[PDB]
Each structure stands twice: as C-alpha cells, then as structure tokens.
A paper describes a structure:
Because only glucose and maltose are exportable to the cytosol, further enzymatic activity is required to prevent the build-up of maltotriose in the chloroplast. This role is fulfilled by disproportionating enzyme 1 (DPE1),4 which is the plant plastidial isoform of 4-α-glucanotransferase (EC 2.4.1.25) that is found in all kingdoms of life, although it is referred to as amylomaltase in bacteria. Data from a number of plants show that DPE1 enzymes preferentially use maltotriose as a substrate, transferring a maltosyl unit from one molecule to another to generate glucose, which is exportable, and maltopentaose, which can be attacked further by β-amylase or starch phosphorylase. The canyon is divided into donor and acceptor sites with the catalytic residues at their junction; a number of loops around the active site adopt different conformations dependent on the occupancy of these sites.
In both active centers, there was only sufficient electron density to confidently build a maltose unit occupying subsites −2 and −1, this being covalently linked to Asp-373, and overlapping closely with the sugars in the equivalent subsites in the donor pocket of ACR-A. Weaker electron density was observed beyond and contiguous with that for the −2 sugar, indicative of a −3 sugar residue. The covalently bound donor most likely resulted from a slow hydrolysis of β-cyclodextrin because the soaking solution should have been devoid of linear glucans. A second protective mechanism could result from the perpendicular arrangement of the plane of the nucleophilic carboxylate group to the plane of the −1 sugar, such that the anomeric carbon is partially occluded and less accessible to an approaching nucleophile, as noted in T. thermophilus AMY, which we observe in ACR-A, BCD-A, and CAM-B (Figs. 7 (B, E, and F) and 10D). The donor site could be represented by BCD-A, and the acceptor site could be represented by MA3-A, specifically from the latter, the sugar residues spanning subsites +1 to +3 with the partially closed gate trapping the +3 sugar between Phe-331 and Phe-446.
Residue numbers in the entry:
A (entry chain A): 60 to 328, 332 to 576
B (entry chain B): 60 to 328, 335 to 576
Write the structure that this text describes.
C-alpha cells in the first residue's frame, strides 16, 4: 500500500528478460546443396556436420526450403505432394547403417557440381527401392516402427491418399488426374480397392520410402535440437492441381462439376499481371469442417519443423482470383480470405504454432492486422532496402523486433551478385548506410547490418557466408530452367570454415545474438 | 463473408503511417546559453534565430531544462519555485517592443563568455522591475491582459502563493520558512492580509514579472509551433523545502507537526538529495490535485516534458531527515498508475518522458509501459558491460528517446578523451568513426540511426566542443550551468552543421 515500506528484497527485484524474446541468427541452406558422391545432398553425415558447424558459429536457426518431392525442374514450390518428403534426400550410407543395404551395393561416386535431378534419380532410386523392399520383407525392430508410422492416424490421414495417388499416376499415362477415367478420377471405393490389389507392391514401397525419409529427417532434427538449433521450414500457401491434396479433397477447392478449377491463383500488375495457376481453396467449404485440411497440414509442418514460413501469407486475408479460362492475370478479382478464424481453428486443433509471414511487395491493411493479431513476424530483406527513400521498410531503422531479417532469400542473387549489378544511386545509397570495407567482403557488410538490426531473428544464405557470386544463386523467378541446382563446392568442407565461423561468432557476440 | 468479392477499392487500401509514430530529432539547448550583451541568454531575438536554424536542419524538437528560478549557483533543478519562470530570461529588447522600456535605457553590453548570475541580475533586474512598474501603472491593452492572467484560476492557484512566499522571504531575514514566526509560517489569514498591505508593491511587481515571462515564453513557444518545432521541458519529481509549493501545501508532504520533514529524498549506493517527500495517501484524498495543477502548468509551458527520477512514482527511497548519509533509508511504495489516471481525468492527454536511467526495478518498467511513456537511452553509457547493455542501438525500442548525452554528461569529445581503453575499442567496433576531431558526429549518427522515435543532441556536440562546454558535473557545487554559445558562433555561421544534420536526418528518415 501507498507510502508504506517495501520488503527488503526490493533492490533485487530487477526486470528479467523474456526468453521468448531472445535475439538469434541462422543460415538458410537446403539439404540438396550438401556435398556428396550421389548427385545431390542428403540427410546423412553432411547434415550432422553442418549442424556442428552451425552450432560452432553461435547460430541457433537452420532454415530449409520445402522438403516435399520437387517438380522435374527441382522446384520445391511446385511439388508433387504437400506432405510427403523428397525421397531423393534419403542417405544411402544411413541405409547401410540400418542394415537395408550393404557397402558393395553403393554406386560409384559421380561429379555433380550442381544437382541434376534426373541423374540423382537414376543413381539412387533403385537402391532406395531395394532398401524399402528389404524393410517390408523383414521381421524385427525396424519393420515394427514402419507399422507404427503407417497406423499412426496423423500419418495415415495424408499418407494413404498420397500413396494411392502415386500408384495411379505411375500406372496411368495421363497429363493429370483431370484425364483419368471416371472411377479413378472420382475415387470410387471399389476402384480404389482394385488399385490396392493391383498396385499393392508399389503402395507398400511408397509408404516404406516415406518412413525412411521420416526416420532420417527426425534424426537430423533431434540432433539439431541437441545442439540448440531450431529448424525453420517453408510452405507455399497453395498446392498444385495434380496432387493427392486436391484429388483426395475435391470439395475443399474451387472446382467445377468435372473437377476443373473455376478460378486459379496469381497477382495483378508493374506488368500485365502474374498468373501462378494453382487451384484456390473453397474457404467457406473448409469453414464447415473447422478447416480440418489446413489443421492436418500444419500438424505435418509441426512434425517436420520447429517453425515455418508461409509463402504468400497475404492470401489468408485476401486473394487474387483469375478465371481458369484465362491467359493473363489482369482479369481477376480480390476475394475475402478466412482471416483469424483459420488460426483460431489451428490453435484449437494443434496448440501453439510458430509461423513466419512472407509479407513482401505491396500489401493491404488487412494483411498487416491479421499478421499482428496472431503475433506472426514478417520479413525484411536488406537487398530491397535501397530503392526509394528513407521510409523503405527494409532499411534497418525501420525494422521491428517481431520480424525476421534476411540479407536475401533463395529468390534473390547472392549479395556479391546483387552488388555487381546494382544501379549507381542505389549503390551510393547503400554505401552511406552500410559499413563497407573491401568490395570483396560486401556480403559481410550486409551480414553485419542484418545482425545489427532490432529484428529478433537474422537469417543469412550459405552462399553469402561463403562470399559467392551470381552463379551460386538458387533461383531466378519466372525462369523455367537452371534453378535449384546449387551445391556447396566439393572443396569447401565444414572443417575448412573456422575463419568464417569465428567471424560470425564475433558479430553475433557484438550484437547480442548468442 | 469468406470467399466473396471485396469492393473495387481493395487494391488502394494501403497501410497508412500513424502520424503519432513520426521519427524525429532535436537539440538540447537551455535558453541561458544564447548569445547576447546582457550577461545571460534570453527569450528575445536569439531564441527565434535558433528556432529558425533548428527548422533549417530538419529537427522538430527543442529540449530545455526546467525554466524555474534557479538557485544562486544557477541550477534549474534546485529552484526557488516549481511553477514560476526565471525572470532573468526576460528579454530587454522585447520589453522595448512592448513599450515598457526605451532604447536609451538599455545598459552598455558586457562580455560574459559564461553566465554569471550575480552579474546578469545587477544588470537586468532594475530594468525588468521598471518595466513591470510601467505595466502596473498603465491603463491599456497590456494592463488588461495582466489582469486576465492574474485572475485566471489556473494561474492563481500557484501564483498568489508564490508571490506572498517571495514577499515574506524578502521581508524576513531567516534561513527557511521553518524559522518564520508562527502566523507567517502557518499562513494565518490576517497575517497574509497584513503582508499584502505592507508588501503590496513587491507582490504586484512579482506578479507583473511572471506575466512578462509568460508573455515572452508563449511567444517563443508559438513561434516554435509555427516553425514545426515542439518544445520539450523537464521537471524534477521533487521540489525544494523552502518554496511556496511546500509552504502553501504542507498537508501534501511528509512533515511533522512543526512543519519539519520526517523523511527526505535520495538513493542508496549513498546519495542524499534532502528534498521533502510527498504524502501520497494524503494526496490521494483530494484526487492528487497538487500534481494535477503541476502538470497543468507543465502543459502550459511545454508540448512534452521529461520527469527526472520518474521511478519515484513506483517506489522511492526515504531517509530520516535526522541523517547525514543516504545509506540508512528504506524503499516506500509510490502511487503508481492511479496518479496518472487522476492526471488524465484532470488534464486530458499528456506527453511525458520517463527518466529511467541507472538500476531500476520491475514495477518501474510496468508503470512506464502502462501509461505509454517513453524511456531514455544514452549512447555515452552504451560501452560498459556486454551486448545486453540497453543503451546499445540494437537494444533500443521505438517508444524511446535516445541521447548522445544529457546536460549531466560531458560532451562526446570530453567523454571520448577520458574513456578507458576497453570501452574505447568496444565503441570503435559499434560506431562508424573517422578522426577523433569528429567523434561527436559519429555518436550523433548512431543516435539518428536508432529505431528510437526521438533523437536529441546537446548543442555542445553539434558544435564539437570539449569538456569546458560541459553543462553540469553532478555532485559539484561550483562552476555549473554557465555554458554559452561562443560569441563568435552565430546561427548564420552554421550552414555546414545544418547541412550535415539535414543529410543525416534525411538518411535515417527523421525529416
Ligand atoms: C514463393 O512461392 C513461389 C511459388 O509461386 C516460389 O516461386 C518459385 O517456384 C515457382 C514454382 O516452381 C516458379 O514458377 C517460380 O519461377 C519460382 O520463383 C518462390 O520461390 C517462393 O519463395
Ligand atoms: C535530475 O535531477 C537532479 C536533481 O537531484 C539533477 O542534479 C543536479 O542538480 C542538483 C540540484 O541543483 C545538484 O545537487 C546536482 O549536483 C546536479 O547534478 C540532474 O541534473 C537532473 O538531470
């Protein structure tokens, strides 16, 4: 009460920092980029080595791209399935440790400066298949865990649909499921039973391969956790038309009576538009079963990652809808998204989640309110900070605490590449704001700025830590060829980055991110 | 409804920046520091020139120290009164424009590289007195405004008390009001009436001089507003014992039956400030009216106001008045948010800055955040300890005022010069530093680059001055509060400094 003495412990009653507010940093590196002899990175020794190296820097976050099966061009964003793992990430050496292969079966190593997906498939698939076959034919512990995995309801609600879809796709020569014969197209029960009988082996193998992915990924994830590293994933808001996700859940999407999309995704114009062409969600239909499809999707995301970015988060508040009949995106309209009620349903369904909102480009007031109402951080990207004036939200003095700052993403050139093509004027702006030593180390200047931010989380692509140029760019949007291929040079091992590790640690130390 | 079309105006529905969140910057400069011929800066031409210069830089905040009558050492923090203005800031030239003096009456100029208060008083007081006398003897517009000022209830609730207190203090030879004879000490009504009769002239002149201060300060304030400059003031949480504030409001303080403080202020290690303390429960019973009036006066003087030792609203150190050292005290519970609720109901929206430096407790932070008041960061304190130091830029908050230093710190150049090596190498890593000559611009730049919404720089640092321009050194009794802009440096002569500031404000979005 007012005017009275405090207890003797008043002087010691200091403010304690909230542990959920802890400043941190991390590295963006997709596992396909790891070194190794089999044409593609994988979840074996290089993953653990990278985790050790990451830990040694003081970083506590590892961000990956979606771990789904990619398209033939390698893209993790136009995947074949929203919940399955990319089986080409499976490590053959780890299969040997599991007793599912022997050393003499391993293929001769190949040089692959960049990932060629066709080549990695030819090399690895037969062996993964053979391992899966031995797993299914065995009795004993590993087989017993396959069964737990298979009969786990949170797995089976997506895994059986995915396996049947893949069995049918394998059996049929057809562009997409729109062209399937009606009983398969529309999942007649006795058609599905007939598929299980006739493609039983394929289905059991597919399931086995997903188990093996899951097992290897969970080991990487538990090892990260033991080293104090959280794993941050990514998911596109939309899924592709030719997938189990759509085919097994037609009523949750905006399709006509024949299963063809009424409306597809995109954004309006600086252009004639941009037509992505994904089917759109039927959000009122989803509302009627408490958003169960999205709840399951997040449950799988939780299973894979500690935290997850959602690409095109703005779509939850309002989305651009183009007539499927159209060739340009400029003919669409904006539709009302589900807003917070979706996230309420997810919370009741799954508990606490950690979502990052990709909120780049021009966005509307409702996007910002939705993001803030669920407490999700947005993004800042230093590479975008030097156009326009001092109100540019990517400039450090405009950063927020509840935010993730990047030097650049997988969609941007490396900092060195970006610097090299930077327009004079943007460059002189940058020179004033950044602390730049030699232009060779331009990537460290940007890294330092990212770390000096008030944003709680700073993420740096591995390409920038390695100071690489444009040829190490992961993706160039709106190109159909030559993306997703980057690998750590075969020369650079995690034993050979002590200087880089020290330099990062010193910066994290200085800006309070350790 | 979910899935339905938005109106056609969706694409244009962009986020608007909130105007209350606008990033800005300003300069700390007390008006006594202005150049001029009369021994001290004043509210005349130099104030308006400075405002013009400030506007030309892009700054939109001018912070002053308390404008109260100071003690004999010049200190605005151990003032004679919490609500009166320092009459020595009154401009003689502005009195000539008001027709209360003529040019021929103005004194010969004197050299005063620093403010000598005794010298400014000898020079200016007779003229201010004479002006006040002509004002009271006149019958026109100006006289009519004096009367409105005098009879305005929001003025008279402090001004009459202050005038009588000063009249008695002038009439009596006594250390403090504790030694006054009982009827004066305890404000017997017929004693006060006797004072009005016998000191009528002194009282009317005192009131007239406060009117003239008010008039000149309000003109400076309006001129600032017209040039897009808000004025930020300061007030110590506590007032001095020998003041009208205590004497006319005894029940609101922790005094014994004889009017001697039971407990006085300070902080532990000790430091004994020795001010009387508030009787917060007694204040509670008239809805904190004393504090409400105080804030009303602060609103009248400033757009925004810092409160020195804000932590005292949540918990305060209380020393027995008996004592010579502060280490034997105890912590007592402050009024918290209920005070600020009362202020809001009384006065409406306020803009308060919490001085929250040093070691502070969890309740201090919660109170500050619950009323939405910004705290402080001071770059000069940022390089001791580790990376969790709250004064480092990466730990700043938006709702915060960042300083390079305050009036209690050395200039950046002076500070740099005495900085110990481990702290100095730390600074070199965080700051962008060129030559030691421009060390103050390195710190200014860091301040401006902060996420803090408001950045304030002492004029000494803009001028790149050393330790001799330090305004105050705490716990010293002599040589403080004297700094003046060198007579050579005019606001016409700071184009380079203006440009350099504008460029930095432009870059960090504070224009
Ligand atoms: C955000 O999502 C988009 C998907 O629309 C990704 O875009 C990449 O992938 C698509 C599909 O493979 C491709 O057509 C684009 O050219 C490519 O940029 C982004 O990478 C994600 O960050
Ligand atoms: C905060 O308030 C204190 C008052 O306790 C000021 O301290 C200065 O003034 C006092 C009173 O004249 C003097 O004793 C100190 O030595 C001096 O530091 C600060 O200046 C204010 O910021």
């Amino acid at each position: 009460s007012v005017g009275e003495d405090f207890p003797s412990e008043y002087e010691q009653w200091l403010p304690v920092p909230d542990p959920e507010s802890r400043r941190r940093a991390g590295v963006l590196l997709h596992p396909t980029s790891f070194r190794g002899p089999h044409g593609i990175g994988d979840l074996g020794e290089e993953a653990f080595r990278f985790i050790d190296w990451l830990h040694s820097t003081g970083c506590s976050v590892w961000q990956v791209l979606p771990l789904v099966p990619p398209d033939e061009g390698g893209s993790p964003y136009a995947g074949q399935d929203a919940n399955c793992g990319n089986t080409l990430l499976i490590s053959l050496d780890e299969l040997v440790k599991d007793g599912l292969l022997i050393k003499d079966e391993l293929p001769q190593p190949i040089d692959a400066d960049s990932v060629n997906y066709q080549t990695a498939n030819k090399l690895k698939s037969p062996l993964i298949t053979k391992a899966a076959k031995r797993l299914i034919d065995g009795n004993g512990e590993l087989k017993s865990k396959l069964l737990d995995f298979r009969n786990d309801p949170s797995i089976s609600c997506w895994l059986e649909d995915a396996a049947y879809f893949a069995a049918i796709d394998n059996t049929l020569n057809a562009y997409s499921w729109f062209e399937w014969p009606e009983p398969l197209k529309n999942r007649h029960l006795s058609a599905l039973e007939a598929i299980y009988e006739s493609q039983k082996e394929f289905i059991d193998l597919f399931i086995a391969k997903q188990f093996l992915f899951q097992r290897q990924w969970q080991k990487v994830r538990e090892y990260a956790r033991r080293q104090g590293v959280d794993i941050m994933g990514d998911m596109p808001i939309y899924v592709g038309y030719h997938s189990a996700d759509v085919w097994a859940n037609k009523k949750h999407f905006l399709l006509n009576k024949k299963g063809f999309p009424l409306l597809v995704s995109g954004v309006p114009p600086s252009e004639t538009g941009q037509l992505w062409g994904s089917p759109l969600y039927d959000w009122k239909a989803m509302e009627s079963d408490q958003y169960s499809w999205w709840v399951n999707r997040i449950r799988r995301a939780q299973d894979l990652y500690d935290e997850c970015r959602i690409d095109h988060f703005r779509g939850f508040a309002g989305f651009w809808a183009v007539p499927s009949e159209a060739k340009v995106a400029m003919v669409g309209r904006w539709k009302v998204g589900p807003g917070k009620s979706l996230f309420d349903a997810i919370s009741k369904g799954v508990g606490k989640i950690k979502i990052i909102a990709e909120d780049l480009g021009v966005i509307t007031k409702d996007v910002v309110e939705l993001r803030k109402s669920i407490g999700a951080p947005g993004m800042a990207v230093l590479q975008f900070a030097f156009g326009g004036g001092a109100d540019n939200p990517h400039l450090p003095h405009n950063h927020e605490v509840n935010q993730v700052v990047y030097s650049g993403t997988h969609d941007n050139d490396t900092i060195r590449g970006w610097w090299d093509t930077l327009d004079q004027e943007e460059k002189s702006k940058a020179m004033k704001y950044l602390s730049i030593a030699g232009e060779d180390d331009i990537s460290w200047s940007v890294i330092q700025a990212a770390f000096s931010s008030t944003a709680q989380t700073a993420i740096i692509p591995m390409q920038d830590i390695l100071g690489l140029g444009s040829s190490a760019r992961m993706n160039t949007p709106a190109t159909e060829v030559g993306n997703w291929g980057w690998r750590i040079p075969s020369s650079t091992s995690f034993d050979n980055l002590e200087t880089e590790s020290d330099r990062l640690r010193d910066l994290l130390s200085l800006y309070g991110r350790l």
